[PDB]
Design an enzyme around this catalytic site. Structure first.
Site, short mmCIF file in Angstrom:
data_model
loop_
_atom_site.label_atom_id
_atom_site.label_comp_id
_atom_site.label_asym_id
_atom_site.label_seq_id
_atom_site.Cartn_x
_atom_site.Cartn_y
_atom_site.Cartn_z
N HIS A 1 -25.47 -28.45 32.26
CA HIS A 1 -25.59 -27.04 31.90
C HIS A 1 -26.92 -26.73 31.22
O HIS A 1 -27.31 -25.56 31.10
CB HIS A 1 -24.41 -26.61 30.99
CG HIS A 1 -24.58 -26.94 29.54
ND1 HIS A 1 -23.92 -27.99 28.94
CD2 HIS A 1 -25.31 -26.35 28.56
CE1 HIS A 1 -24.24 -28.04 27.66
NE2 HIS A 1 -25.08 -27.05 27.40
N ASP B 1 -20.08 -31.89 33.47
CA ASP B 1 -21.29 -31.50 32.75
C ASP B 1 -22.18 -32.70 32.46
O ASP B 1 -22.28 -33.16 31.31
CB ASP B 1 -20.92 -30.80 31.44
CG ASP B 1 -22.10 -30.11 30.81
OD1 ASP B 1 -23.17 -30.05 31.46
OD2 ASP B 1 -21.96 -29.61 29.67
N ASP C 1 -19.30 -31.47 13.34
CA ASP C 1 -19.28 -31.29 14.79
C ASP C 1 -20.70 -31.26 15.34
O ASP C 1 -21.66 -31.01 14.60
CB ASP C 1 -18.54 -29.99 15.15
CG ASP C 1 -18.18 -29.89 16.62
OD1 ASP C 1 -18.44 -30.84 17.38
OD2 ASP C 1 -17.62 -28.84 17.02
N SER D 1 -26.69 -30.56 23.23
CA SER D 1 -26.23 -30.92 24.58
C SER D 1 -27.10 -31.96 25.26
O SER D 1 -28.33 -31.93 25.17
CB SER D 1 -26.17 -29.69 25.46
OG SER D 1 -25.16 -28.82 25.00
N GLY D 2 -26.45 -32.88 25.97
CA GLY D 2 -27.14 -33.98 26.61
C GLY D 2 -27.30 -35.17 25.69
O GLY D 2 -27.60 -36.27 26.14
C1 LIG Z 1 -25.57 -26.82 26.08
C2 LIG Z 1 -25.28 -27.48 24.72
O1 LIG Z 1 -26.42 -27.42 23.90
C3 LIG Z 1 -24.16 -26.81 24.00
C4 LIG Z 1 -23.47 -27.80 23.05
C5 LIG Z 1 -22.24 -27.13 22.39
C6 LIG Z 1 -21.37 -28.18 21.65
N1 LIG Z 1 -20.41 -27.50 20.81
C7 LIG Z 1 -19.49 -28.24 19.95
N2 LIG Z 1 -18.64 -27.59 19.21
N3 LIG Z 1 -19.50 -29.66 19.93
N4 LIG Z 1 -23.18 -26.32 24.92
C8 LIG Z 1 -23.01 -24.88 25.12
O2 LIG Z 1 -23.70 -24.08 24.51
C9 LIG Z 1 -21.95 -24.37 26.08
C10 LIG Z 1 -22.67 -23.91 27.32
C11 LIG Z 1 -21.66 -23.67 28.44
C12 LIG Z 1 -21.09 -24.75 29.09
C13 LIG Z 1 -20.16 -24.52 30.10
C14 LIG Z 1 -19.81 -23.22 30.45
C15 LIG Z 1 -20.39 -22.15 29.79
C16 LIG Z 1 -21.32 -22.37 28.79
N5 LIG Z 1 -21.25 -23.33 25.38
C17 LIG Z 1 -20.27 -23.68 24.36
O3 LIG Z 1 -20.03 -24.85 24.12
C18 LIG Z 1 -19.52 -22.61 23.55
N6 LIG Z 1 -18.37 -23.20 22.94
C19 LIG Z 1 -19.15 -21.46 24.48
C20 LIG Z 1 -18.14 -21.92 25.53
C21 LIG Z 1 -18.54 -22.09 26.85
C22 LIG Z 1 -17.63 -22.51 27.81
C23 LIG Z 1 -16.32 -22.76 27.45
C24 LIG Z 1 -15.91 -22.59 26.14
C25 LIG Z 1 -16.82 -22.16 25.18
#
Ligand SMILES: *C[C@@](*)(O)[C@H](CCCNC(N)=[NH2+])NC(=O)[C@H](Cc1ccccc1)NC(=O)[C@H](N)Cc1ccccc1
Ligand SMILES: OC[C@H]1O[C@@H](O)[C@H](O)[C@@H](O)[C@@H]1O
Ligand SMILES: *[C@@H]1O[C@@H](C)[C@@H](O)[C@@H](O)[C@@H]1O
Ligand SMILES: [Ca+2]
Lengths: 201, 94, 249
Positions: C41, C90, C181, C187-188
């Site tokens: 993502h 992902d 958390d 991410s990654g």
């Molecule tokens: C991309 C990464 O930097 C980031 C990490 C988030 C980790 N969060 C926790 N609590 N450990 N991921 C995101 O921002 C994702 C992006 C995304 C992924 C799949 C579908 C849509 C968006 N967004 C989130 O993690 C938020 N919780 C929003 C969300 C998206 C999708 C499903 C549920 C919530």
């Protein structure tokens, strides 16, 4: 629906001999048990068994003051995205293990006084290749209640001791019977053991 | 006393309770009746088969190592064969 | 990372920083001199794939101490089953244009065998997650690399937090008390599990409901499901074009 989750998980524990029990009898499936402390790695036991029980004594005696959680996995038979499982209730051995039935070791009489000695019950807690005694584990937390009476006693009298001996007063010519109970007053559950076998003069 | 059945196997020791018993087992045994041998369980699902890294069945019992490591003589330990093996932290290691 | 600590320089040596147009994008995990594991993502919105850069041996983004090594990402490989804007699958495999040099400050995390990860690593309670992401939910990103110890959950125990949202290609880790958390920008990044003196890759920071929100956990990509897929691709010959949707399984 290749498997069904175990249920009615129950801790059977006495002098730290600790067995996990569950249902149902396996139909076309086998069980594997895991146990851990609140923050420890999961340790597996009873691999791919058809038993509806698992001895977890050797795990819990490592630290009897820790709070343990176990879980039973169901695996399809012959076919050993995770397997179905069920969690046990939490279990803290030091606070919940049943005190075993005590036994009167000896009793001596001289004059108007009597010694009643309780045998130091050994537990499943191994240390240095030896089993620790009930009092090695609990120390001052453990007391004994002596019930004693005679043929003409309208009711049993009670004595108490922080050790394993009672020193009571008695009537000169009369024979008394005895019975002891193990108590841990600080507990909230399983506070008392069953009564000992009765010994009479 | 319910110990008269002598349920505690393998040199175990029976102790009588009110309406049941408990078995004190030798160090090599466990179970309600000391029936389980602790030695006869060399499998990958059980403490990684005693392998430091990788394990295989079917019957370790054949341990193996990740690249940059090799299997030592004990047949379970792995040792690095390169300067910077994966999953190790030089700054702490030194 | 929320509620964590600064990772001492060099103690998270497999951590990768991904940049686009010099801007902070995501984290990643070095698994050998050529290949990096990240989250799919992270690449949903890339416009110019030529300006995609991986930095190893990084620690403080506001400084440059000389231990940093930059490489251009020659290829981003993503499961064909992955769908932009959703959570499942992902994961991404990045080929660096040239290998990095292994040093005290740059070291790969081990990619474990599937069986070993499923049978043994999966039951190690705690694992480390790291990154330069947000220090709080909807807060600012970190300048120094942050790290955090989190406990792993089997999915029946996570089910309540995310009803019908945790696939077999995911797992939860963290705290339902809302204190610690991973977060946006992490991410990654690796979810790294220690076993008998060696660290392994078990997860990838993927998603969550907020960050450290009460009653919920971080969701991580279950790397064990992709071992075979990753290893097959690390043998495949390079192809033209930066992005590549490789069939999964
Ligand atoms: C991309 C990464 O930097 C980031 C990490 C988030 C980790 N969060 C926790 N609590 N450990 N991921 C995101 O921002 C994702 C992006 C995304 C992924 C799949 C579908 C849509 C968006 N967004 C989130 O993690 C938020 N919780 C929003 C969300 C998206 C999708 C499903 C549920 C919530
Ligand atoms: O469970 C095995 C059985 O063996 C014999 C014992 O005397 C019983 O008390 C016991 O139940
Ligand atoms: C009772 O305890 C067990 C553990 C063994 O030591 C036996 O020899 C003994 O009688
Ligand atoms: Ca820097």
């Amino acid at each position: 629906t290749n498997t069904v989750a175990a249920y009615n998980l129950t801790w059977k524990s006495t002098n730290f001999k600790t067995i996990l029990e569950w249902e149902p009898k396996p139909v076309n499936q086998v069980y594997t048990v895991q146990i851990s402390t609140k923050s420890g790695d999961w340790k597996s036991k009873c691999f791919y068994t058809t038993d509806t029980e698992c001895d977890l004594t050797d795990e819990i005696v490592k630290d009897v003051k820790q709070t343990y959680l176990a879980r039973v996995f169901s695996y399809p038979a012959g076919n050993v995205g995770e397997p179905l499982y069920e969690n046990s209730p939490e279990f803290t051995p030091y606070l919940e293990t049943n005190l075993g039935q005590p036994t009167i070791q000896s009793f001596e009489q001289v004059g108007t006084k009597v010694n009643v000695t309780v045998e130091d019950e050994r537990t499943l807690v191994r240390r240095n290749n030896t089993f620790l005694s009930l009092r090695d584990v609990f120390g001052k937390d453990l007391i004994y209640t002596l019930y004693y009476w005679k043929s003409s006693s309208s009711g049993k009298k009670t004595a108490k001791t922080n050790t394993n001996e009672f020193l009571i007063d008695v009537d000169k010519g009369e024979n008394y019977c005895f019975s002891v109970q193990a108590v841990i007053p600080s507990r909230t559950v399983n506070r008392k053991s069953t009564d000992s076998p009765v010994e009479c003069m | 006393d319910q110990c008269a059945s002598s349920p505690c196997q393998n040199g175990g020791s029976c102790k009588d309770q009110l309406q049941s018993y408990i078995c004190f087992c030798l160090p090599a045994f466990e179970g309600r009746n000391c029936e389980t041998h602790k030695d006869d369980q060399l499998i990958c699902v059980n403490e990684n088969g005693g392998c430091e890294q990788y394990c295989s069945d079917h019957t370790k019992r054949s341990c193996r190592c990740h690249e940059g490591y090799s299997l030592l003589a004990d047949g379970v330990s792995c040792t690095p064969t390169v300067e910077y093996p994966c999953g190790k932290i030089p700054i702490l290691e030194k | 990372i929320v509620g964590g600590k600064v990772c001492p320089k060099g103690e998270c040596p497999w951590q990768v920083l991904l940049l686009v147009n010099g801007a902070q994008l995501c984290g990643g995990t070095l698994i050998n001199t050529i290949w990096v594991v990240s989250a799919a993502h992270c690449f949903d919105k890339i416009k110019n794939w030529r300006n995609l850069i991986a930095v190893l041996g990084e620690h403080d983004l506001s400084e440059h101490d000389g231990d940093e090594q930059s490489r251009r990402v020659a290829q981003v490989i993503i499961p064909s089953t992955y769908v932009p804007g959703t959570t499942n699958h992902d994961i991404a495999l990045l080929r660096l244009h040239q290998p990095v040099v292994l040093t005290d400050h740059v070291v790969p995390l081990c990619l474990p065998e599937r069986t070993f990860s499923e049978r043994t690593l999966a039951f190690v309670r705690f694992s480390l997650v790291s990154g330069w992401g947000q220090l709080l939910d909807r807060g600012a990103t970190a300048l120094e690399l942050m790290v955090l110890n989190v406990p792993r959950l089997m999915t029946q125990d996570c089910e309540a937090s995310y009803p019908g949202k945790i696939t077999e290609y995911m797992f939860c880790a963290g705290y339902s008390d809302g204190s610690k958390d991973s977060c946006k920008g992490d991410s990654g990044g690796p979810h790294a599990t220690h076993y008998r003196g060696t660290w392994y890759l078990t997860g990838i920071v993927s998603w969550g409901q907020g960050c450290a929100t009460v009653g919920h956990f971080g969701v991580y990509t279950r790397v064990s499901q992709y071992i075979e897929w990753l290893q097959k691709l690390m043998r495949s010959e390079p192809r033209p074009g930066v992005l590549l949707r490789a069939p999964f399984p």
